[PDB]
């Protein structure tokens, strides 16, 4: 949970502030996108599934980087960090599918818009190649995201009770991170810029 | 429907001789329609004798590694090697067993006991160390007293 | 807007109802869908055909979400709001009520959208709902949901770069300014064609529907049959023609030939179907292809004819699905060779089967007949060859229709008895609406 | 800033308390103090968001004009405005 | 021959009735294995 | 029933206010550092309300501390529910008239999803440990110990139910009949002395229940003496 | 004298109730807490009163009815319980001079939720389980040693019957009573087993070493000899005692005696001790972390979560 | 059943073949250690040692005591789950 | 003959013990451990205040234990499946061993409903099963899924209950075949009905309640009188453990 | 209704055991080698980004075509005693 958020955030910020180069990273973006998508499709293990999902998301962030426009980069990083925060402190499994739909780019929640402005800026430079690759990888994400949904939505509801006190010690942060469906209201406007 | 004898558990009672990895014979009573490994858990085998299934939408299913003698080979329900379930089984061979593989290596989750299985004898197959997630792993050492039957739940998460 | 928000909050109160009082649960769930029907009635009473081509305009600031009413959207809303209570009458779980409430909300919001990005966002917000609906554990098929969801996502992902490109080109996402700016019509046109050729069943990318509409239960089946295909036609009419005409023109031979081959192959494929539900599934394809060709013809009155045909199918086909669902539920199977002697067994139900079969076959005293007449008028004015192709194969659909009807209805009596009061009530709105629109639709 | 931001925040806090009781198996309406605190938090947070939009927009117009991109005054009102939209 | 109702309505499920209760599944067909295949 | 809605909203608001007050008193106890509130003492309730729906108890009626009633329970004049018995009216109303005994750990209630309201007459003796679900009973019937009465069956006034028998659903038994068996059936008619014993049965239960109430009142006096 | 018997503050040592406050900080905090308590109680009562008739019932503790008296009657012979003077308040208020309470052997164990009242004798090591009722009000109840009353069983007597013979119920030593069993006006001899859910009627008597099948129905005034097994409704003789079944009854006696002892141990604990145990479990789970910072300095006792010695 | 009934038999015969106290042709696929071979308990122990050495297993003393025939050894090996 | 004291408790021995006849108000706990056997219940479990639950008992999902019911898992492990109904004053018990030779634990499958006054002891209850009132299943018997057991029915030990059928009687016997609809929905119907009732009861849970005030008032009075006593259970337990060790070591040689 | 699994159970299980009686090594070496290769030669594609799109897509199709899947990877060389 720590690793997915902090060093990535700091490195993106330092890149945005004090970095320039005279090259491209597009082939590495292709590597990340394709490999992460295929692996997250093919790995039955939930840990490795989320690992390859993270690889695909960091590839998406790199694609956003290569075409500049760091505003979408920032907002998508924030959304993904919110989702990761919601992920690793889960006690009920009913909300677990909300993470998938916030990662699979389903419309009504923030993952969709976070991928959406990224696509908008990619088209703003007409980066046809990487935009098409990102679209295809986004499609491939949906398979294992629906698999996640099946695994932890269409199941009997059961949650173990605490015994050593600390009764569901992370309800507050969980339910707070859940309130991301209300974010797109403020998000749709030119906010992060 | 007439004087048909009352239904008793004896008519569905299945007995299998199971020998541990330490070479100790053990008597186990099984029931028709249920998996062998479920009864194995029901007997008191240590948690180290089991492992998660490596398939999709089946990771809540436990299993144990056993050897099937030559006679009972045909009683093992067939599985397509080309199938996704077959791919999960092959991943199980690839990871759990490694060079512990024997031509009698089999998985108890695909053993549905019946009348013919009465009197069948199998033993436990050795396994390599493994880890699934934070709450269920295998050190590679069978030094434990905790019963797999004592786990309240099977958390894939 | 305020009224709409009141309905939105009022519908959500279903979950807050304790499950102990089932009677009130059913009452509340039904009334929540009842209200929008009266609201749309009030809108229609409020509309002016002597007024602007758009009326009841409202915009939610810089949040896109442009809502306005034409005749097409109002009629589609009316038909949907008629359909939904019947679907509610066929459900028994709170989850189904919530899913269908959200689906109805999304459909209504998209029906009067005026923002292309808004349509993009609002339309496919129900894809997860359909996924959960179709692949239910005891009776559904996961494969059908997988199929349809992947097809819809593929279409939307193809469209999105075009949508954002035209947004940047014109600086906004409102149709009334998108229609007024110069743009690279070609790319957006391909995006729109891809999405609305996936949504409306068009060959070759149409194969999700036969599995989906059959694996789903009766309520979802009626929803999918009568609503989501018409989202494609209203999509064309509201967006593609007003925005990018040159692409529409240069693609017209392609669209026409694709629609024709779709109609022909679907019509021929239907005869080899061995299940009633699959037969009903293939039936809608020809209607949608006819609607699309009528829209693309633009000859004399294309929009009105297309709207008439869309209303006609959304009226008649749900009755076919109702009969199929009744027969399956009170039979536990959908396989044809277990249906025989239904007229003596189900007199009124079999009579309704006959009537709605004729409705599917475009016969006079029915809205479908006038609908296809107007569509063929529009097609003929463009060219007579396309109109002949539509006219020549009229026999081939009625072939399978009559064959299946006679096979399952006449013969040795075996199976369920006739329909119940609830089933006749569910049938009733479609019969009355079809009669009313086939006698005096206008005045 | 948006007109109904604080109402949106209160609705978010309402759902927040609902799902907090969900996560502990309690009835949705139990522990109303949590509901009130969450409503206050959401109201203030989304008011802050509404004000931050105005802050960012003023920053945008200032930066754009300083670079040399001078605007006719008619569209400056699209940025130089604390509009209660 | 069962009594799934009372003399004044009041549908009785008849869980412990010896007779086979008429239900929604009453008119289900008996599937033919060849047809199913 | 808009009155039901008004009652319900009043109950919900008062319930939330009770929540807030009790929580704040828990916080105050924490500040005072005494955790007697934390005690896992038994919460078993003689009178358990259902939202706004409250049992109605005659001033001459009585319930044991172990005895419990829930929902709109109506116990008539000099009507007794003995120790540990559970008569439930949370879902369906149960109506009981005058001089009726619900013996120790006997069940009368309606919890089948289609169980109608339960009616109990007068001079009604339900034996120790009998189960009654969705049934109506006339006056002056001996309901046997550990017996089962199923739904919508009519026990006409004056019959006999032998102990431990099972009465099938909707199976009406006419008056003055002795019935036995799990597939219960008529055995014979009531005898004169047996009927006389039944007629003398109620008053002994009445006097004993009054005495039990007196002893319970004494014990509650001592309970108060501990803190009062 | 674990390691810090003389240094740990009383708050840690006495978590149920802190001692009297000393400092101004402590006194002000106590006053604020008292104000909080009062305001919360006022709010609770306001909510109850606006709530209406339903709130009229309050949280009141249940009386300890496992040992409850019954009425000393002239005709009823006290032979199982024992007459005791009533509390002075009862006599001065509602004219109660003599009450009869059960004669219970100290080694016996009764669950905290049972209903035992009046003329009852409990044998040494005899047990009464949860949810049962033993109302000795009009006659006597005699239970032998090492005799068990299982859960939700019913024991009652008859002062007046169909034949009008007030017959007490006698239970011998080493006697087993089943779960949710029924006992009324019957005599049970020694080393006997009564099935769970069975039903015993009046005038019945069971010889020693006999078997009552579960769920069976005993006819009124019927005698069943030794060495026999009876079942049916009404019961019929089926089989004789197998050699192992008497030893099975003895095993039941032994094992349920052990169970009664363990349950008495679990039940006879004070509230403050239970809270101490809860806190100990909490600290033990806090010590379940191998990376706990204390584990390279302080070694704790497993049973008490207190430092016994340092590790290094 | 854990191994083939034939290959085990030929391996047993081969390991029997290299004993100085035995006759190479007197060894049969099924025989008796005492009556046929005239070998004592210690010779039987040595037999068990040789068989286990070839088959790479471990046999406790009690099982060896139960073993007194060639078929006994073959069926014991085929019943051993650690067979290789 | 066992002493009521346990020096080897998982929490330590009890220093002061209180006689039951000295109790002036009932202190009956609904749920409590048994030595090193501890309960396991869902967060949204309905436990009636007069119910009895102890020790190594497993409960899954939306199951419920109603008024006066007993689940005494002292001799074995007890498991309760998802959304399983236990009505008022029923007992789920077990033994140390059974003639069948299987685990003596009593297993209850998911969506299994139980009427009041039922005794369950060392039986395997497959999911989706109805249990009647005054009905008992003995040790080692198995009830197959999709089955309905009539009230006042006796199930002898080591017996079998074939699925898809209605059975009853004393002893139990065939009655009729369960209809396909009955298998499909009715069992789940009862499950959901009684779960809805259990959640209805759970909604108005004022826990822990306010009755502790009077006991707190009495203790506070004792404090004012000073007669309320301070006892360090931790250090007294340490002294008792040391005394046990010393006395035990002083009796071998 | 249920379709039958094709083939024999014994043959299919034996195929499931084809090329699996082998110890799994550590994944560290592959990871180190991949990182070393990227650190050493990825600069060769620096001039690539200007190349005509047709050639780049041809290269992409070739690279996709010649790939070999790491999971379930087996060789005849795993069970031979000599080259
Ligand atoms: C919690 C504490 C537990 C204890 O320590 S003991 C308290 C609870 N113990 C019990 O369950 C006691 C009753 N158990 C037994 O069943 C026993 O004692 C019961 C002994 C007579 C007999 O149980 P068995 O397992 O020995 O069954 P049998 O072989 O004796 O059965 C013979 C016959 O009697 C019938 N029978 C057997 N048991 C019963 C019953 N119970 N009721 C009615 N009819 C029965 C049965 O129909 C049989 O005929 P069929 O099935 O037709 O062939
Ligand atoms: C590195 C090695 C170091 C060795 C140091 C230890 C050496 C110990 C040697 C001495 C041990 C003994 O003699 S131990 C004494 C053994 N003698 C007895 O027990 C009395 C009866 N004789 C037997 O049992 C014989 O073994 C026999 C007649 C063959 C029975 O034939 P079988 O066998 O068919 O049974
Ligand atoms: Zn009595």
What would the DSSP string read from start to end of C369-399? Answer: HHHHHHHHHHHHHH-HHHHHHHHHTHHHHHH
Q: Which atom of ligand 1 is nearest to the CA of B8?
A: 51
Spell out the residues 6+ positions from residue I146 whose beta carbon is closer than 8 angstroms to its own. I128, I129, I163, I164, I178, I183, I187
Contacts of C135 in chain A (CB under 8 A): 150
Asked if residue A187 lies in contact with residue A75, where contact means CB atoms within 8 angstroms, the answer is yes
Phi/psi of residue C210, nearest 5 degrees: -60, -40
* Residue G207 CB burial class (10 angstroms; 0-12, 13-18, ≥19): middle
Closest CA to B154 of B139, B140, B133, B128: B133
What interhelical angle do C142-170 and A128-152 show, nearest 10? Answer: 140
What does the alpha-carbon distance between residue C329 and residue J49 come to, in Å, rounded to a whole number? 62
Residue C123 φ then ψ, to 5°: -60, -60
Structure tokens at G272: 């403050």
CB I65 within 8 A of CB I42: no
Using the CB atoms, write b or e for I22-36: b if 16+ within 10 Å: ebbbbbbbbbbbbbe
Q: From CA I15, how far away is CA I27, in angstroms rounded?
A: 18
Q: G164, A192, J51: which is closest to D53 by C-alpha? A: A192
- C-alpha H70/C-alpha H73 separation (Å) is 5
The answer to whether the beta carbons of residues G208 and G190 sit under 8 Å apart is yes
Please work out, in degrees rounded to the nearest 5, the angle formed at the alpha carbon of residue F79 by the alpha carbons of F76 and F85: 115
| The token pair that represents I72 in the structure block | 């005494």
Which residue in I29, I193, I30 sits closest to I115, CA to CA? Answer: I193
* β-bridge pairing I129-131 and I113-114: parallel
D39, containing H or E segment: helix D32-66
Alpha helix positions (H), chain G: 10-13, 24-51, 88-94, 243-267, 271-286
F228/chain I closest Cα distance in angstroms:
8
CB interface of F with E, residues 100-119, below 8 Å: 112, 114, 116
Residues G240-250 as b or e (16 or more Cβ within 10 Å = b): ebeeebbeebe
Does residue A174 contact residue I49 with C-beta atoms inside 8 Å? no
Chains J and A touch (3+ CB pairs under 8 A): yes
The residues that bridge with G182 in the sheet, in sequence order, are G154
CA distance G120 to G139: 9
Instruction: Tell me the β-bridge partners of F155.
Output: F137, F173
Residues on chain G touching F23 (C-beta within 8 angstroms): 40
Distances (CA, A) of C224 to C100, C214, C216, G97, I72: 11, 10, 9, 83, 53
- Rg (C-alpha) for chain G, rounded Å, is 27
CA distance F162 to G234: 11
DSSP, collapsed to helix, strand or coil, labels residue E24 as: helix
Residues 93-122 of C with CB under 8 A from A: 120-122
Calpha distance B146→J37 (Å, rounded): 47
Q: Is G184 annotated as a binding residue?
A: yes
Provide the token pair at G187: 């005599």
Answer left, alpha or beta for residue B44, where phi above 0 means left and psi between -120 and 50 means alpha: left
Task: Tell me the DSSP string of C343-370.
Answer: HHHSHHHHHHHHHHHHHHTT-SSSHHHH
Would you state the structure tokens that stand for residue G13, as one six-digit string? 């040592």
Selection from C111, I197, A70 nearest residue F89 by Cα: I197
Alpha-carbon gap, residue F20 to G237, rounded angstroms: 64
Q: Enumerate residues 402 to 431 of chain C having a beta carbon within 8 A of any beta carbon in chain E.
A: 415-417
Instruction: Report the C-alpha gap between F43 and G59 in whole angstroms.
Output: 8
State the CB neighbour count (10 A cutoff) for residue C197: 22
Distance between CA atoms of residues C154 and C30, nearest Å:
35
Give the whole-angstrom CA distance, residue I55 versus residue I37.
5
- Give residue H31 CA to ligand 2 midpoint distance, Å: 25
Do C329 and C437 meet the contact criterion of CB atoms below 8 Å apart?
no
F101-102 and I85-86 beta bridge pairing: unpaired
Interface of G with A in 243-282 (CB under 8 A): 278, 281-282
In angstroms, the CA I67 to CA I88 distance is: 5
Q: Which ligand is nearest to the CA of H42?
A: 2
Residue C290, φ and ψ in degrees, nearest 5: -60, -40
Q: H or E stretch including G224?
A: strand G223-224
Question: B136: Cβ–Cβ under 8 A, 6 or more apart, which residues?
Answer: B52, B155
Question: Would you call C212 exposed, middle or buried from its count of C-beta atoms within 10 A (0-12, 13-18, 19+)?
Answer: buried
Contact I219 F39 (CB under 8 A): no
What is the residue-wise DSSP string for F162-213?
Answer: -TT-EEPTT--B-SSEEEETTTTEEEEEPPHHHHHHHHHHHHHHHHHHHHHH
Distance G129 CA to ligand 1 centre (A): 23
Give helix then strand counts, H and E, for chain J. Answer: 3, 0
Residue B8 burial by Cβ neighbours in a 10 Å radius (0-12, 13-18, 19+): middle
**Tokens read off for B92:** 């199980």
Residue having the nearest C-alpha atom to atom 16 of ligand 1? I156
Distance CA F56, CA F49 (A): 10
**Using a CB-CB distance cutoff of 8 angstroms, which residues of chain A are in contact with residue J72?**
none
Chain D residues inside the 8 Å CB shell of F23? 31, 33
Cα radius of gyration rounded to whole Å, chain B? 16
Cα(C358)–Cα(J6) distance, integer angstroms: 46
Strands B65-67 and B105-107: antiparallel
Give residues after which chain F gaps, C-N over 2.5 angstroms: none
For ligand 2, say whether the CB of H41 is within 6 Å of any of its atoms.
Answer: yes
Helix (H) or strand (E) holding C290: helix C276-297
State yes or no: G156 annotated in a binding site: yes
CB I215 within 8 A of CB I25: yes
Query: With a 6 A CB cut-off, is I138 part of the ligand 1 pocket?
Result: yes
Residue F201 φ/ψ region, left for φ over 0, alpha for ψ in the -120 to 50 degree band, beta for the rest: alpha
Strands F185-189 and F177-180: antiparallel
Tell me which residue of I99, I126, I130 sits closest to I114, measured CA to CA: I130
Rounded-to-integer distance, Cα H48 and Cα H54, Å: 10
Place of tokens 């396309």: C386
Q: How far apart are CA C124 and CA C113, in angstroms?
A: 13
Give the separation between CA H43 and CA H33, rounded to whole angstroms: 9
User: Which atom of ligand 2 sits closest to the CA of residue H42?
Assistant: 33
Q: Report the alpha-carbon distance of residue C105 to residue C4 in Å, rounded.
A: 10
Q: How far is CA B13 from CA D33, I100, I120, I163, in A?
A: 59, 9, 21, 17
Query: How far is residue J23's CA from residue B128's CA, in Å, rounded to a whole number?
Result: 9
Would you call I26 and G112 a contact, using CB atoms and an 8 Å cutoff? yes
CB contact under 8 A, I194 and F111: yes
Q: What is the C-alpha separation between G170 and G203, in angstroms, rounded?
A: 12
Q: Does the beta carbon of H40 lie inside 6 Å of ligand 2?
A: yes
Question: Which residue of the set H36, H40, H43, H61 is catalytic?
Answer: H40
Q: Quick one: DSSP state of residue D14?
A: H
Query: F20 Cβ partners below 8 Å, 6+ apart?
Result: D32, D33, G40, G43, G47
- How many helices, marked H, and strands, marked E, lie in chain B? 2, 9
Q: What is the DSSP pairing of strand B136-138 with strand B130-133?
A: antiparallel
The closest of F164, I150, F154, F134 to E15, measured between CA atoms, is I150
The verdict on a CB contact (< 8 Å) between B98 and J14 is no
CA of D72 vs chain A CAs: smallest distance (Å)? 21
Bridge partners of I93?
I121
Q: Tell me if A94 sits within 8 A of D23, measured CB to CB.
A: no
Report yes or no: D43 and D10 within 8 Å, Cβ to Cβ. yes
Bridge-partner residues for I177, per DSSP? I165
- Output phi, psi for J6, to 5 deg: -70, 155
Question: Which is the closest atom of ligand 2 to the Cα of H40?
Answer: 34
Q: Considering only alpha carbons, which residue of chain C is nearest residue E29?
A: C331
Token reading at G139: 């006659």
Count the Cβ atoms, other than its own, within 10 Å of residue G233.
24
CA F205 – CA F200 distance, rounded (Å) = 10
CA-based max dimension of chain I: 74
For I69-134, where are the E strands, in sequence order?
70-80, 85-86, 91-93, 106-108, 113-114, 118-121, 124-125, 129-131
3-class state of residue G223 by DSSP: strand
DSSP count for chain F of H helices, then E strands: 2, 19
What are the residues whose beta carbons fall under 8 Å from the beta carbon of A73, sequence distance 6 or more? A12, A16, A61, A64, A65, A118
Which residues hold their Cβ within 5 A of ligand 3, which is an ion? Answer: G 156
Percentage helix, strand, coil for chain H under 3-state DSSP, each rounded to 5: 50, 0, 50
CA–CA gap between residue C326 and residue C245 (Å, rounded): 45
**Nearest one of A61, A30, A55, A28 to A42, comparing CA atoms:** A55
Residue with tokens 């399983």: I84
Q: Cα separation of F226 and G64, whole Å? A: 13
What is the Cα–Cα distance from G273 to I234, expressed in whole angstroms? 9
Resolution at which this structure was determined, Å: 5.4
Check pocket membership of H62 for ligand 2, CB cut-off 6 A: no
Minimal CA separation from J20 to chain B, in Å: 6
CA torsion A91-A92-A95-A99 (nearest 10°) is 30
Alpha-carbon gap, residue C165 to C147, rounded angstroms: 28
State how far the Cα of F141 lies from the Cα of F124, in Å rounded to an integer: 6
Question: Which residues of chain E lie closer than 8 angstroms to I166, CB-CB?
Answer: 16
Chain C interface includes D2 (CB < 8 A)? yes
- Give the number of C-alpha atoms closer than 13 A to the C-alpha of residue C191, restricted to the C-beta side: 24
Question: How many Cβ atoms from other residues are within 10 Å of residue G68's Cβ?
Answer: 22
Q: Are C325 and C237 in contact (CB under 8 A)?
A: no
- The secondary structure element, H or E, covering residue F143 is strand F142-143
Question: What does the DSSP 8-state code read for residue B133?
Answer: E
Nearest CA to ligand 2 atom 28: H40
Helix (H) or strand (E) holding A17: helix A6-18
Compute, in angstroms, the gap from residue G198 CA to the centroid of ligand 1: 12
Q: Could you give the angle at which helices C22-46 and C2-16 cross, rounded to 10 degrees? A: 170
Is H40 an annotated catalytic residue? yes
Residues whose CB is less than 8 angstroms from the CB of residue I113 and which lie 6 or more positions away in sequence, other chains included: I84, I85, I87, I129, I130, I131, I187, I190, I191, I194
Residue E21 DSSP code: P
Which residue in chain C is spatially nearest to I202 when comparing CA positions? C18
DSSP assigned state of A91: -
Structure tokens at F154: 């009519």
């Amino acid at each position: 949970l720590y690793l997915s958020t902090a060093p990535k955030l700091s490195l993106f910020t330092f890149w945005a502030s004090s970095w320039h180069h005279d090259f491209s990273v597009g082939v590495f973006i292709l590597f990340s996108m394709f490999i992460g998508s295929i692996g997250a499709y093919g790995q039955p293990a939930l840990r490795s599934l989320f690992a390859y999902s993270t690889i695909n998301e960091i590839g998406l962030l790199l694609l956003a980087v290569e075409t500049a426009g760091f505003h979408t980069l920032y907002q998508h990083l924030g959304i993904y960090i919110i989702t990761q925060l919601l992920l690793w402190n889960l006690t009920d499994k009913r909300l677990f599918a909300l993470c998938a739909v916030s990662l699979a780019g389903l419309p009504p929640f923030a993952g969709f818009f976070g991928k959406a402005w990224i696509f908008w800026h990619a088209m703003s430079v007409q980066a046809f190649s990487l935009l098409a690759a990102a679209l295809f990888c986004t499609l491939l994400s949906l398979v294992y995201y629906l698999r996640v949904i099946r695994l932890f939505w269409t199941a009997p509801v059961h949650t173990a009770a605490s015994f050593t006190g600390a009764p569901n010690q992370t309800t507050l942060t969980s339910a707070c991170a859940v309130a991301l469906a209300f974010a797109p209201v403020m998000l749709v406007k030119p906010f992060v810029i | 429907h007439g004087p048909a004898q009352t239904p008793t558990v004896f008519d569905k009672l299945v007995e299998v001789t199971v020998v541990d990895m330490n070479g100790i014979r053990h008597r186990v009573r099984g029931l028709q329609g249920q998996s062998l490994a479920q009864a194995l858990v029901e007997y008191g085998f240590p948690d180290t004798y089991f492992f998660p299934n490596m398939g999709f939408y089946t990771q809540h299913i436990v299993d144990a590694h056993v050897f099937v003698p030559k006679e009972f080979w045909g009683k093992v329900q067939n599985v397509d090697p080309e199938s996704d379930d077959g791919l999960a089984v092959k991943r199980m061979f690839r990871d759990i067993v490694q060079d512990y593989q024997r031509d009698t290596s089999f998985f108890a989750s695909y053993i549905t006991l019946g009348a013919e299985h009465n009197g069948m004898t199998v033993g436990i197959g050795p396994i390599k160390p493994w880890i699934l997630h934070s709450e269920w792993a295998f050190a590679g050492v069978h030094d434990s007293r905790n019963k797999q039957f004592d786990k309240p739940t099977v958390e894939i998460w | 807007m305020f009224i709409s928000v009141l309905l939105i909050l009022f519908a959500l109160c279903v979950t807050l109802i304790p499950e102990a009082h089932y009677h009130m649960v059913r009452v509340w769930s039904f009334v929540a869908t009842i209200i929008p029907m009266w609201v749309v009635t009030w809108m229609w009473w409020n509309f002016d055909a002597s007024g602007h081509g758009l009326q009841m305009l409202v915009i939610l600031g810089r949040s896109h979400l442009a809502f306005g009413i034409d005749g097409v959207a109002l009629s589609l809303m009316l038909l949907t709001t008629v359909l939904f209570p019947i679907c509610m009458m066929l459900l028994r779980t709170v989850a189904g009520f919530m899913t269908f409430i959200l689906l109805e909300v999304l459909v209504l919001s998209a029906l009067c959208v005026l923002d292309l990005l808004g349509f993009y966002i609002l339309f496919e917000a129900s894809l997860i709902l359909l996924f959960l609906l179709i692949g239910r554990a005891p009776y559904g098929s996961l494969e059908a949901a997988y199929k349809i969801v992947l097809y819809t996502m593929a279409g939307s992902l193809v469209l999105l770069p075009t949508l954002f490109m035209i947004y940047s080109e014109c600086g906004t996402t409102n149709v009334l300014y998108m229609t007024c700016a110069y743009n690279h019509q070609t790319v957006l046109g391909w995006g729109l064609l891809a999405v609305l050729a996936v949504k409306i069943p068009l060959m070759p990318v149409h194969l999700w529907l036969p599995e989906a509409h059959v694996a789903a239960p009766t309520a979802g089946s009626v929803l999918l049959a009568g609503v989501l295909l018409k989202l494609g036609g209203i999509g064309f009419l509201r967006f593609m023609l007003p925005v990018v005409p040159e692409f529409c023109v240069s693609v017209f031979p392609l669209v026409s030939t694709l629609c024709l081959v779709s109609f022909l192959f679907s019509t021929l494929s239907t005869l080899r179907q061995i299940d009633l539900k699959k037969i009903v599934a293939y039936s809608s394809i020809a209607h949608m292809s006819m609607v699309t060709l009528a829209i693309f013809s633009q000859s004399e009155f294309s929009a009105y004819s297309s709207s008439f045909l869309m209303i006609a199918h959304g009226l008649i086909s749900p009755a076919l699905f109702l009969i199929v669902g009744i027969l399956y539920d009170r039979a536990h199977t959908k396989f044809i060779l277990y249906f025989s002697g239904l007229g003596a067994s189900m007199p009124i139900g079999s009579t309704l089967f006959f009537l709605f079969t004729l409705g599917n076959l475009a016969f006079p005293l029915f809205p479908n007949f006038i609908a296809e007449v107007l569509c063929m008028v529009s097609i003929f004015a463009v060219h007579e060859l396309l109109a002949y192709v539509f006219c020549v194969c009229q026999v081939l659909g009625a072939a399978y229709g009559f064959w299946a009807f006679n096979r399952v209805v006449h013969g040795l009596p075996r199976g369920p008895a006739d329909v119940t009061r609830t089933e006749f009530h569910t049938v009733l709105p479609l019969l009355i609406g079809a009669v009313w629109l086939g006698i005096k639709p206008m005045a | 800033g948006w007109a109904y931001s604080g109402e949106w925040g209160m609705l978010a806090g309402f759902c927040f308390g609902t799902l907090k009781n969900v996560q502990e198996g309690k009835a949705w309406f139990r522990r109303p103090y949590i509901h009130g605190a969450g409503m206050i938090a959401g109201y203030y947070l989304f008011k802050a968001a509404a004000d931050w939009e105005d802050e960012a927009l003023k920053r945008i117009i200032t930066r754009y004009e300083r670079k040399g991109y001078a605007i006719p005054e008619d569209r400056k009102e699209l940025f130089a405005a604390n509009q209660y939209k | 021959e069962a009594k799934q109702f009372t003399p004044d309505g009041k549908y009785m499920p008849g869980i412990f009735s010896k007779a086979k209760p008429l239900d929604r599944s009453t008119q289900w067909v008996h599937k033919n294995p060849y047809i199913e295949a | 029933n808009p009155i039901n809605g008004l009652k319900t909203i009043l109950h919900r608001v008062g319930f939330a206010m009770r929540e807030s007050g009790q929580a704040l008193e828990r916080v105050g106890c924490r500040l005072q550092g005494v955790y007697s509130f934390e005690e896992k003492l038994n919460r078993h309730a003689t009178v358990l309300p259902m939202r706004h729906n409250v049992p109605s108890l005659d001033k001459t009626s009585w319930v044991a501390p172990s005895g419990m009633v829930s929902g709109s329970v109506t116990l008539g004049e000099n009507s007794s529910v003995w120790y540990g018995a559970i008569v439930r009216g949370d879902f369906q109303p149960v109506v009981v008239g005058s001089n009726s005994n619900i013996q120790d750990a006997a069940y009368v209630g309606a919890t089948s999803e289609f169980s109608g309201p339960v009616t109990i007459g007068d001079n009604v003796s339900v034996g120790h440990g009998a189960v009654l679900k969705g049934c109506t009973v006339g006056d002056n019937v001996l309901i046997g110990m550990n017996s089962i009465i199923s739904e919508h069956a009519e026990i006409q006034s004056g019959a006999v139910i032998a102990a431990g028998s099972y009465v099938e659903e909707g199976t009406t038994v006419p008056s003055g009949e002795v019935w036995a068996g799990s597939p219960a059936k008529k055995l014979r008619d009531v005898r004169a002395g047996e009927a006389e014993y039944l007629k003398s049965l109620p008053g002994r239960y009445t006097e004993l229940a009054g005495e039990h109430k007196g002893i319970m009142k004494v014990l509650k006096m001592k309970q108060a003496e501990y803190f009062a | 004298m674990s390691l810090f018997k003389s240094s740990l503050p009383a708050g840690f040592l006495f978590p149920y109730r802190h001692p009297k406050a000393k400092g101004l900080v402590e006194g002000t905090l106590y006053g604020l807490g008292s104000l909080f308590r009062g305001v919360g109680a006022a709010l609770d009562e306001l909510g109850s009163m606006v709530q209406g008739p339903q709130g009229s019932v309050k949280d009141h503790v249940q009386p300890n009815l496992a040992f409850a008296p019954v009425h000393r009657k002239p005709d009823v012979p006290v032979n199982a319980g024992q007459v005791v003077p009533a509390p002075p308040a009862a006599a001065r208020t509602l004219k109660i001079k003599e009450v009869v309470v059960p004669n219970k052997h100290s080694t016996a164990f009764v669950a905290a939720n049972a209903n035992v009242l009046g003329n009852v004798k409990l044998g040494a090591g005899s047990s009464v389980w949860y949810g049962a009722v033993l109302r000795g009000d009009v006659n006597g109840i005699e239970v032998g040693a090492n005799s068990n009353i299982q859960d939700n069983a019913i024991v009652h007597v008859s002062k007046y019957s169909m034949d009008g013979t007030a017959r007490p119920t006698v239970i011998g030593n080493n006697v087993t009573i089943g779960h949710a069993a029924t006992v009324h006006a019957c005599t049970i001899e020694d080393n006997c087993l009564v099935g769970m859910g069975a039903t015993v009627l009046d005038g019945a008597t069971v010889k020693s070493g006999s078997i009552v099948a579960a769920g069976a129905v005993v006819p009124p005034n019927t005698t069943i000899p030794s060495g026999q097994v009876w079942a049916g409704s009404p019961a019929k003789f089926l089989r004789h005692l197998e050699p192992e079944e008497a030893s099975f009854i003895g095993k039941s006696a032994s094992c349920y005696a052990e169970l009664s002892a363990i349950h008495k141990f679990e039940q006879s604990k004070t509230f403050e001790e239970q809270y101490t145990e809860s806190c100990i479990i909490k600290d033990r789970a806090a010590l379940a972390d191998p990376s706990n910072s204390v584990h390279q300095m302080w070694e704790y006792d497993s049973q008490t979560a207190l430092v016994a010695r340092a590790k290094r | 059943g854990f191994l083939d009934k034939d290959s085990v038999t030929e391996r047993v015969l081969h390991v029997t073949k290299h004993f100085e106290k035995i006759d190479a042709s007197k060894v049969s696929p099924a025989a008796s250690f005492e009556k046929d071979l005239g070998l004592d308990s210690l010779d039987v122990v040595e037999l068990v040692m040789a068989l286990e050495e070839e088959f790479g297993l471990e046999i406790p003393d009690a099982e060896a005591d139960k073993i007194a025939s060639v078929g006994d050894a073959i069926n014991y090996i085929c019943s051993n789950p650690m067979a290789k | 003959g066992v002493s009521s004291q346990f020096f080897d408790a998982p929490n330590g021995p009890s220093v002061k013990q209180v006689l039951i006849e000295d109790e002036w108000y009932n202190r009956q706990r609904s749920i409590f451990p048994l030595l090193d056997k501890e309960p396991y219940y869902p967060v949204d479990v309905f436990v009636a205040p007069n119910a009895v639950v102890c020790g190594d008992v497993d409960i899954y999902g939306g199951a419920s234990v109603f008024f006066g019911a007993v689940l005494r898992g002292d001799l074995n492990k007890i498991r309760l499946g998802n959304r399983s109904a236990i009505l008022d004053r029923a007992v789920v018990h077990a033994a140390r061993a059974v003639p069948t030779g299987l685990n003596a634990a009593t297993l209850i499958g998911e969506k299994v409903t139980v009427e009041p006054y039922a005794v369950l002891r060392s039986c395997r209850v497959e999911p989706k099963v109805i249990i009647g009132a005054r009905s008992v299943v003995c040790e080692g018997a198995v009830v197959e899924s999709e089955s309905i057991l009539a009230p006042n029915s006796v199930v002898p030990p080591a017996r079998r209950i074939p699925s898809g059928e209605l059975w009853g009687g004393s002893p139990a016997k065939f009655i009729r075949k369960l209809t396909d609809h009955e298998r499909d929905r009715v069992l789940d119907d009862v499950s959901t009905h009684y779960h809805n009732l259990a959640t209805m009861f759970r909604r108005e849970a004022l826990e822990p309640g306010t009755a502790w005030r009077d006991v707190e008032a009495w203790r506070q009075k004792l404090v004012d009188q000073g007669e309320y006593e301070w006892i360090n259970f931790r250090e007294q337990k340490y002294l008792m453990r040391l005394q046990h060790e010393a006395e035990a070591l002083e009796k071998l040689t | 209704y249920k379709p039958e699994v094709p083939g024999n159970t014994v043959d299919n299980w034996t195929e499931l055991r084809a090329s699996w009686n082998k110890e799994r090594a550590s994944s560290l070496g592959t990871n180190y080698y991949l990182n070393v290769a990227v650190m050493g030669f990825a600069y060769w594609l620096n001039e690539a980004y200007y190349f005509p799109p047709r050639t780049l897509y041809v290269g992409a199709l070739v690279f996709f075509a010649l790939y070999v899947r790491k999971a379930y990877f087996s060789t005849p060389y795993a069970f031979k005693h000599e080259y």
